[PDB]
């Protein structure tokens, strides 16, 4: 039974219920994420920005089955074109807007990766991707407004691939946490 999360802490409690088992009801998880109305005071502790690139701030380690983190995107900060390592990936905007560009998996032949579509993700919206849907790039294209997003990955993963848009070639990268549970982790 899916109720509206009243606070971020309430959302986290609900997520622990939704991931108590071995499978994932994507539509339910996305609906509850969308229904939490971002309250900046509740997540300020995790919103630790870096001047030069976006940061990943761990909020909850889940039950072994999922990670929940907040990503903080300065003006003009963006990601690589990335996969998600055979995991579910949910992305909910907490502040600002992000552009999501979708790409197909490359062919073996070296070729430019042409976007299949793009969309603007707006405050409180929750998007979803997995490797069967494709690859994506996420960007804060704003010149004036930082963005903050809430990400849930299941299972957790700390490596993925970045893809060279000019060739489709991939390289494994390890993802690091800028902070964990509100504590900066250099």
Looking only at the bridges linking them, the beta strands covering 81-82 and 117-121 are unpaired
Looking only at the bridges linking them, the beta strands covering 55-60 and 135-139 are unpaired
77 carries a ligand binding annotation = no
d(CA 54, CA 52): 7
> What region does 105 belong to: left with phi over 0, alpha with psi -120 to 50, or beta?
beta
- End-to-end CA separation in angstroms for the chain: 40
84 carries a ligand binding annotation = yes
Question: 3-state class of 16 per DSSP?
Answer: helix
d(CA 107, CA 122): 32
d(CA 17, CA 178): 27
82 carries a ligand binding annotation = yes
The annotation places the binding site at: 82, 84, 136
The annotation places the binding site for Fe cation at: 82, 84, 136
């Amino acid at each position: 039974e899916l109720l509206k999360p009243r606070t971020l802490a309430d959302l986290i409690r609900i997520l622990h219920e939704l991931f108590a088992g071995d499978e994932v009801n994507v539509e339910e998880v996305q609906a509850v994420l969308e229904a939490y109305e971002s309250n900046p005071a509740e997540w300020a502790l995790y919103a630790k920005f870096d001047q030069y690139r976006y940061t990943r701030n761990l909020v909850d380690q889940g039950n072994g089955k999922f990670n929940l983190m907040i990503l903080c995107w300065g003006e003009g900060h963006g990601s690589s074109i990335h996969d998600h390592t055979d995991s579910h990936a949910f992305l909910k905007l907490l502040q600002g807007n992000l552009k999501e560009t979708l790409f197909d998996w490359p062919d073996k032949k070296s070729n430019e990766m042409i976007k299949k579509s793009e969309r603007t993700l707006r405050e409180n919206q929750c998007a979803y991707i997995n490797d069967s849907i494709g690859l994506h790039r996420v960007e804060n294209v704003s010149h004036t407004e930082p963005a903050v997003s809430l990400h849930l990955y299941s299972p957790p993963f700390d490596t993925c691939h970045a893809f060279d848009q000019r060739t489709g070639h991939k390289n494994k990268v390890t993802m690091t946490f800028h902070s964990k549970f509100g504590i900066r982790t250099p």
